């Protein structure tokens, strides 16, 4: 029943199957890193991410006079085995908390079924996997074997609080926006969280609030997983498509723009900032993309490799994209089924909806201003649980989101930096 059927310890010996030294397809080179496969298609790498981006391999904090507003540096974070063990257990617990909700189960299921499309070959009559959607796992005999995967959770790069969903691009194909999908690497940490304010007028003001309430890290991870969902099904919205915020004087005076992809991901009222016309434009766009994939699958009859058969992969993508098949054997995209899947990934899986399922206090909108960053430790059950997060039932932290109240549950939060006034 649990999402992660094993209680991994960082020091558990490698077995070359689900505990192994691996290398990622970053085009650059690296020494193997110890990784853990926590569920089918999902791996966790308890290391700071100095791999997906060759230029971002320096964790050292730049000169103090060169740092920005919302940012936090600590070159030493996640450098010891104890931290890595705690990181692994923290991420595992968050997957369990997410999976414990019907919405989370639905999202995680969609992610596991969202295998990146096999479209790296030139012969349209040949299905081949794109190697950047794989990792190289060191087998017991010391040899490398390629394994496809959908998701990897890795530690943050230099700026510890810059969580994000990233993936390797293609020379020509826009994998996250052409329906194909690509392996998603989420830079994330269960060891820190952010403070927000309970009053909307204060939370959306850059000069007020110290961050009384702490964001539940399960929501933060879910937010990234929602992005991963969009990207795995190749329906993410181009980052250049943004909303020139005209509903917040502080954003306005600074010309701040928020991508539609973020508004979509948050959901709730934020999603409404994307008008119908442009919304229909995107939907039709991805519908065509799914159609192209449907035809590529029709022309495709031969396959590369021998790990899986053609009849298997064709069905794999028929299942992923929920396509239809006629008497002959030709696939087509069903109007109704496409809209249902598209809507599930973009409107059902949202941050706002996860807040409803977790019963936690959270920012009411994406268009706000961070107040602070806190150090936390969600591994001990006396601190945080799969079922209640910080708001432990049958304790003084059970009601009124007392567990998330950093003033009441002060022992669970260490403020590392204040952001208010720095904007």
């Amino acid at each position: 029943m649990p999402f992660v059927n094993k209680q991994f310890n960082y020091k558990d010996p490698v077995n070359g199957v689900d505990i192994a030294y691996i290398k990622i397809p970053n085009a650059g080179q690296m020494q193997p890193v110890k990784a853990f496969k926590i569920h089918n298609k999902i791996w966790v790498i308890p290391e700071r991410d100095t791999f997906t981006n060759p230029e971002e391999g320096d964790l050292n904090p730049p000169p103090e006079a060169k740092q920005v507003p919302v940012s936090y540096y600590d070159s030493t974070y996640l450098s010891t085995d104890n931290e890595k063990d705690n990181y692994l257990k923290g991420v595992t617990k968050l997957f369990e908390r997410i999976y414990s909700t019907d919405l989370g189960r639905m999202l995680l299921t969609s992610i596991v079924r969202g295998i990146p499309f096999w479209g790296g070959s030139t012969i349209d009559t040949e299905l081949k996997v794109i190697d950047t959607n794989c990792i190289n796992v060191i087998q017991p005999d010391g040899s490398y074997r390629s394994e496809e995967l959908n998701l990897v959770i890795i530690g943050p790069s230099a700026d510890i609080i810059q969580f994000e969903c990233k993936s390797f691009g293609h020379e020509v194909l826009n994998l996250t926006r052409n329906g194909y999908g690509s392996t998603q690497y989420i830079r994330f940490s269960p060891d820190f969280t952010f403070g927000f304010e309970e009053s909307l007028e204060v939370d959306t003001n850059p000069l007020l609030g110290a961050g009384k309430f702490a964001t539940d890290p399960a929501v933060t991870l879910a937010h990234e997983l929602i992005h991963a969902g969009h990207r795995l099904y190749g329906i993410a919205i181009n980052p250049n498509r943004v909303f020139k915020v005209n509903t917040n004087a502080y954003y306005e005076m600074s010309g701040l723009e928020v991508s539609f992809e973020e508004l979509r991901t948050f959901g709730g009222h934020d999603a409404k900032f994307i008008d119908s016309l442009q919304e229909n434009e995107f939907r039709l766009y991805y519908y065509n993309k799914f159609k192209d994939i449907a035809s590529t699958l029709n022309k495709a009859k031969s396959i590369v490799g021998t790990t899986a058969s053609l009849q298997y992969m064709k069905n794999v993508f028929k299942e992923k994209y929920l396509l239809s098949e006629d008497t002959s054997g030709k696939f087509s995209v069903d109007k109704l089924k496409f809209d249902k899947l598209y809507k599930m990934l973009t409107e059902i899986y949202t941050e706002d909806n996860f807040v409803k399922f977790f019963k936690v206090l959270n920012r009411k909108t994406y268009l706000n201003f961070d107040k602070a960053v806190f150090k936390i430790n969600i591994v001990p059950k006396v601190n945080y649980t799969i079922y209640d997060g910080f708001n432990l039932r049958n304790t003084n932290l059970a009601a009124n989101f007392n567990g998330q109240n950093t003033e009441i549950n002060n022992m669970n939060f260490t403020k590392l930096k204040n952001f208010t006034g720095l904007f």
């Binding site: 969580f163 952010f194 937010h223 992005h227 973020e262 994406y366 201003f369 961070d370 904007f423």
Partner: peptide, 4 residues
Amino acid sequence: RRGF
């Protein structure tokens, strides 16, 4: 991404 968390954003501002």
